[PDB]
Amino acid sequence: TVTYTARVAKARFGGFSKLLLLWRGSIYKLLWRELLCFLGLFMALSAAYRFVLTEEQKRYFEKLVLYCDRYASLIPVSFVLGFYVTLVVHRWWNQYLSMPLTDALMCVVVGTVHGHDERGRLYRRTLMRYAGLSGVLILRSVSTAVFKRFPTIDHVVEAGFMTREERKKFENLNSSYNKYWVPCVWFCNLAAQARREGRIRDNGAFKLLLEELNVFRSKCGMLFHYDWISVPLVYTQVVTIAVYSYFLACLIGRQFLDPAQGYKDHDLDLCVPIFTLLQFFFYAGWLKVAEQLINPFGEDDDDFETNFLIDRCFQVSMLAVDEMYDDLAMLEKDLYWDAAEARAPYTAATAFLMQQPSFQGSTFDI
Amino acid sequence: TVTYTARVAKARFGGFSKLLLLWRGSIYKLLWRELLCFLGLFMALSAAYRFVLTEEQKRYFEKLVLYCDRYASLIPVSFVLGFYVTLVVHRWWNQYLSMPLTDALMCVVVGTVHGHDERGRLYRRTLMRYAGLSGVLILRSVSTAVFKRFPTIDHVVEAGFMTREERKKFENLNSSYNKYWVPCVWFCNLAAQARREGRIRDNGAFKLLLEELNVFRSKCGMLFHYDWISVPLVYTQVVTIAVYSYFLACLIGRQFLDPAQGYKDHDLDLCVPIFTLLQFFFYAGWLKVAEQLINPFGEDDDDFETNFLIDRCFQVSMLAVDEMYDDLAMLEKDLYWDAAEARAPYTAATAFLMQQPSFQGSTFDI
Amino acid sequence: TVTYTARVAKARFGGFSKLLLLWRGSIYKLLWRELLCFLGLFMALSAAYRFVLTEEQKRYFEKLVLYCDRYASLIPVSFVLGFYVTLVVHRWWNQYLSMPLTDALMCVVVGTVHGHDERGRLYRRTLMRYAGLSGVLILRSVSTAVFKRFPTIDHVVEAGFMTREERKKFENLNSSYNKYWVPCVWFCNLAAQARREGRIRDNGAFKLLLEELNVFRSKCGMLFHYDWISVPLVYTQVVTIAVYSYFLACLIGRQFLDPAQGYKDHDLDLCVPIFTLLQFFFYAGWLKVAEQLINPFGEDDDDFETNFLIDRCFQVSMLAVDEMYDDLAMLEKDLYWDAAEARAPYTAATAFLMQQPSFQGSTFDI
Amino acid sequence: TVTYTARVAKARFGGFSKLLLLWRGSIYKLLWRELLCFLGLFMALSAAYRFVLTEEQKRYFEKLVLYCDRYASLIPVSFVLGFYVTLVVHRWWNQYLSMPLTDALMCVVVGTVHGHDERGRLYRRTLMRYAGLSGVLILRSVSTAVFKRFPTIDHVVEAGFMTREERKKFENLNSSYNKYWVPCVWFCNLAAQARREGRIRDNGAFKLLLEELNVFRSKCGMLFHYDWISVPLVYTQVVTIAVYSYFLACLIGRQFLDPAQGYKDHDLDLCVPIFTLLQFFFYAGWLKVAEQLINPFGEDDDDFETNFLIDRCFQVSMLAVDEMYDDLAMLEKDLYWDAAEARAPYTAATAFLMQQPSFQGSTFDI
Amino acid sequence: TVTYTARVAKARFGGFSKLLLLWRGSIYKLLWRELLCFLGLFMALSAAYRFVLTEEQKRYFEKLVLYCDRYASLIPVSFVLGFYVTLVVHRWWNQYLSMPLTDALMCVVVGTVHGHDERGRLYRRTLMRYAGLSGVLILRSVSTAVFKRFPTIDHVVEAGFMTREERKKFENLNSSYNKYWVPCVWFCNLAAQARREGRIRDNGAFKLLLEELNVFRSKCGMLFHYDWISVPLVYTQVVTIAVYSYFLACLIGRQFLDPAQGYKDHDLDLCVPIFTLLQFFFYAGWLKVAEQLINPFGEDDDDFETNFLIDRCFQVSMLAVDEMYDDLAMLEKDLYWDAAEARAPYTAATAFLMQQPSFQGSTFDI
Numbered sequence A, B, C, D, E: 001t002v003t004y005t006a007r008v009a010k011a012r013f014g015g016f017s018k019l020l021l022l023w024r025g026s027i028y029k030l031l032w033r034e035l036l037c038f039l040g041l042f043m044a045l046s047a048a049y050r051f052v053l054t055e056e057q058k059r060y061f062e063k064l065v066l067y068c069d070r071y072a073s074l075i076p077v078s079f080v081l082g083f084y085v086t087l088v089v090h091r092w093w094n095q096y097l098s099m100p101l102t103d104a105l106m107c108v109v110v111g112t113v114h115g116h117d118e119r120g121r122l123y124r125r126t127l128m129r130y131a132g133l134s135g136v137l138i139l140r141s142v143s144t145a146v147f148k149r150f151p152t153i154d155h156v157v158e159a160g161f162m163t164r165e166e167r168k169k170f171e172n173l174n175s176s177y178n179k180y181w182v183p184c185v186w187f188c189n190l191a192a193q194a195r196r197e198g199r200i201r202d203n204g205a206f207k208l209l210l211e212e213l214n215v216f217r218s219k220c221g222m223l224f225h226y227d228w229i230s231v232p233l234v235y236t237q238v239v240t241i242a243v244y245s246y247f248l249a250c251l252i253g254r255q256f257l258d259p260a261q262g263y264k265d266h267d268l269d270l271c272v273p274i275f276t277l278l279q280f281f282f283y284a285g286w287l288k289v290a291e292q293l294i295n296p297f298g299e300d301d302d303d304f305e306t307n308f309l310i311d312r313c314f315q316v317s318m319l320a321v322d323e324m325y326d327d328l329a330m331l332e333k334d335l336y337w338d339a340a341e342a343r344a345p346y347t348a349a350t351a352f353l354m355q356q357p358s359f360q361g362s363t364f365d366i
């Protein structure tokens, strides 16, 4: 992922303009090859027209240039691009929201699975490790970076996510389908065992744990669904054919004709179609947005950082359920115990922007 | 379904371009018949104009070609296509999300319906078989492939989803409506019986089972709703009439006229309207996207694999509630029991991409 | 409703094309009157131009035709149509999802309200009859067909939805607002009474019943909201004025002028503006989609079958809570009790399409 | 609000056309002033061109008319109008869904807060009065009509929503923010007191009451959010500038030039630009849709009837929790106690439309 | 934020027109610098054309002006602007809905965490202070204004949100990730301790507290997600390149040519391209909407008032859980205890608008 929200915190004079100077995850890094290809074909065709082609053939070539320029439609391709890219962006954001995150699970576990002893600590750590393991399994199924990090289940075992005995139980299961759901079933069994053993004190807490487990598992299933069910291939081919047809039309129809013929709208030759190159940037980049977001778990610069999320979730969950279990500072009175109003101070840098009348409603200025 | 998300993992130089070489579920497999039809009529009309028609009639024909070319509107049809196809894609994705999946139900059942004996195992297996049976009934009601797999309720009985006695109870019910809901009512009765018999230990667990059953059943009802309530026929006819009207206008208005008349914008004859064929690919394929997704439970290559989902759900649910019930590896300390940080290693292939500073927030680089 | 999803199960050569041959709920049944009106005015104006008008007045008339043709904008009306029709379709689908359906309620009732005796059966039947009655009341408030089926509350009483005593309690309430909510309050009181009497065994079950009752009632309230709050009249008038203004411009601006004057783009007279008639089909039908879906509870062919849904819900709910209460086939072992894999057979018609490698993930083909 | 869904129940020959004859909440009532202004400036400019301006200045004026007509872009403004109005309509509908309605709360209260005595009745009435009071407070904060109905908190006290003692507690709180949330905190305290006193019998019921209270309060907070956070002013200014720029271009560029000069596309003078007036209706009304819906709690004819909703909710909630508490007709057998099928009769007006085969699925006609 | 919903309460004659006179958060405050830049380059180029350039070079310059005017496409950029700005507005509103608000938490705490003594008050205050602290941590991570208010964790400690001992526990945790989640884990531990100590009376109440805590924490996580995952940089660059390419085309192609050459569509020179300046306002402001909303936690005038929300939430939560805990006015009969109807009076200003027949349904006027 490429984060630039710090740069665009305000609508400045040169806010979006300086974003064109970035390289990592930029339009240039995605297009420059197609840009050089389009420029190469355009320059080769222009050179052939200027030198190689006969005078007789040049009249036919320029008539074909006019014909190809008449059918260069830039408006209709904008519709198919807008709709297709909007669908791809919707899928991309929903895919990000489906990342297996264990924050809800860690909060429930640290608040419901009890015991300062070795067994309670084993319960909490194993409950969160099961969710981490199912996250790792689904992500290595869907993400190329995680798969290269965990090429085999042996890599998962050496990483500490799954144990030797859990590995034997995992491989002995007779199923031809992806087994990312297995640690979730293990989580359900372990939660039921903890409730039976009294580690979970109340019936509500067990229900809350299974509700939060099914939310986590549904996110894993949704990542599998997005991975399996692509954007329909026919629609991707339609947008690609529209864009490539328009650019093939622009390659010939926008060729610089000899001004000596005096054809209208073609009485100039700048030997570089800079406005056609700007249109190429526009439409080719608009397609490149979808081409980068269509599978957001690849190795694009703007693709999701799945390995970082795995590491963060594992470390934070272990910290929260093990070192932070029932480890609280003693209850004491805050700065505003005796104060009628509870208001924090402002720094010298924020006071002169703040201290303004508080909004009470639209109807109170009558 | 045609899955190609592996191919588009990155925005490559030839990423979307190579997707035009695929055949299964492609634009070509859907259009080539209409493509040959349009080319046949265009070539026949051009040949009649060149040879059969009189010189006097050819002036009238070319005037009619100019008239038909003036009304060839390619922009307005793009709007109706964009909106209609977006609605169809919304329905298509929501229909996929309505597939009867039993993962949530299997997690709740394995965590709440207890007993290593024959009766507890019968309870778990039958509870998941009821959900599987209702899934099979709704899918054979909505999917052509599942219907050809289960042409009669006898096929459902031989498949093991429903028993002889359950079949007699099923057929004896006096109702003229689809009975896909019957196994859900059986599930509710069986869950209540299990709670009464003590197989479900706590009141919360029974509530969680009925909540998850009503989610499963609502998905079945939603598939029935999508099957019954089509995209409004008037709107489908509007988009079809717009596309076919535009292509009838393009068939005549884009006819290659004799250059001897010297008509403007018609001083060339390539005997093949390749740019009109590219526009045909574009608009006809854009309509074909909706034509393929309007009923995603048919036998199109990109249609949903309902039989595979039935098989996967049945096998996985039986495995999870029967062989995985209370079958856990003993609780043991993980690799990071004594480690302050819980972090997994990286392979040689991922280390040189990873090991980058972790994102802390937009405001921490001031 | 007009269901055609069986016809469009696959993207065939003549898939959408044959949908233009349907009549029930089609574009033709909605437009043919406006079509005849537009053709009548066009033909009358053309005949007046050809015969009645003087030679001197014909120059002014053809200048006015050119002027009216210059302002015939077909692109801008497409935007207002697309956005307005998308809003209407969103409201139409959300209105369908708000239909009062009692499947969730019947599942909860059959699983929570107990007793094989007359009193338990009365409890279950009356609980579902209250939800049915509130559904009937809201639907007769919003649907013309249901209102013609239940013109008075006497018709509701004779239909068996409400009793004589319930009628007296209903009419004695002092309120000037629609009383569709009354049976929901009766449901809440009856559920509380059943819990107090021990018919509902557990506290969770009572909470689940009130949660499912409030979902049912919110759907009834949402139907009332959609009925009360129309699509804003100003926006409907804007779309109607845009469409009618464009068609008034097309009626005159597309008039066939006498070729003897030699005006450009008007050197032909086919005495029938077939391309203008196709554009009429397009835009008038696009408006007709909204005109049919704006109130989906009327008597249009594609409008919702509210009476059928009332009958289905009543019959199915009574069956589920009365004849299916605790009526289960005895627990027995299924076909796959001893099988490691639980897989159903395939018919001869589906085997040669199926038996393909199961999708495991995008990253497993490296 | 202007309700016309009865008129548009069917797609009739003159369905939407007769909606142009309505006045209350119509396009005419919103535009006629701007319409007269635009016509006044157009007629004054045309009269000045015809009479006051010199012959020499008229050539410059008509050149400026051609220049202003060349930049009159009607397509691009349609995009900004479509997107902006769609956003405003989304906000408008979501604002309607955020109205503080107490139906869910009344159902829970009547089903959970018990006692036929004075204290139980006081509990139920006060619990619903607290929700009503918070609704009144937020609505008088956001709605001009409710504010004019309750200009002071004294008006709230005289209306019976808040008492003298509750008023003293309300004013004594030290906070500079809107106190619409205060009755919700009172509701929580009163519910906890009722549970402690045994008026609420079960722990689940208390949880259901606090869940329904937080839904009600979130709707109040969401109304406050919509009131505070306007549609971004920059975007409103963009749409206004686009529309006004286009209409300033149309005021001059569409001026009727003298036909004596023989300028192309300007060889007529109808002294009234009726097609420009129709375009004014279109674009100005499209902007007026947003201008009316941007704040739906004002005094527009199509604005929400907040006072009516306050009255309805108060009266219905008091009726449901006080007169309908545990007031049920005795349980008796319905018309279909002995009938295998539970089906209601049809009137003579609906039988000949109904009695059609019931939809069973798409796959059952093979 | 700039609130103007009071001004637009009604669709007035000069409603949106007077919004163009505002300055704070207006289009002018965002664009005037780019406006002066564009005018400066246009005037400099026009002056160079008029004076500095030779007569021979002026023919080439005006041919280049015609060439650049032919490729000035204002329609296609409208599509990319509409779609991109709609995505940005969707993200902006969802980001506002993700603000950490503690109203739901305060209602649950005041209704579930009991005790008039010092320990119960400490419990309630600390529970709400933990949620406030996590809100402050995430907001100072995402908002520039909050970061300038809390540049260090020392500022958080002096503000009273976190204590000395809580600070030592906070810093001693070994994690390289943002620790905004830590106070949520503390909340879970404190809630579990309160339930164990009997401060929370019932098991349901503890579950409701953890459910509301996970909603609060998910909102904090969602703010972190929006901060980390920007709108894809490629798409922002595409929209910026399209807008800047169009304006570079308009800078030259719309240059006022010398009328002495008699070029068509260029026979005038107003030395100021006011219609090009209006188009600049339109497109540049449309981009500025996204440029301001892309990061809504900056210091733009229309950006969210995060500091005000922190202050409001802290003060209101402390008031609700401390001064309002079990502090109720005694239960007494309301104004409508003996009244069959519960209806409030209307003021003289609202009666003559109100007192209209109540909407009962669409079907009751037959």
Ligand SMILES: [Ca+2]
Pocket: A008, A009, A010, A011, E291, E292, E293, E294, E295, E296, E297, E298, E299, E300, E303
């Ligand atoms: Ca900003």
Ligand SMILES: [Ca+2]
Pocket: A291, A292, A293, A294, A295, A296, A297, A298, A299, A300, A303, B008, B009, B010, B011
């Ligand atoms: Ca990618």
Ligand SMILES: [Ca+2]
Pocket: B291, B292, B293, B294, B295, B296, B297, B298, B299, B300, B303, C008, C009, C010, C011
């Ligand atoms: Ca299909």
Ligand SMILES: [Ca+2]
Pocket: C291, C292, C293, C294, C295, C296, C297, C298, C299, C300, C303, D008, D009, D010, D011
């Ligand atoms: Ca209708």
Ligand SMILES: [Ca+2]
Pocket: D291, D292, D293, D294, D295, D296, D297, D298, D299, D300, D303, E008, E009, E010, E011
């Ligand atoms: Ca308004």
Ligand SMILES: [Cl-]
Pocket: none
């Ligand atoms: Cl619950």
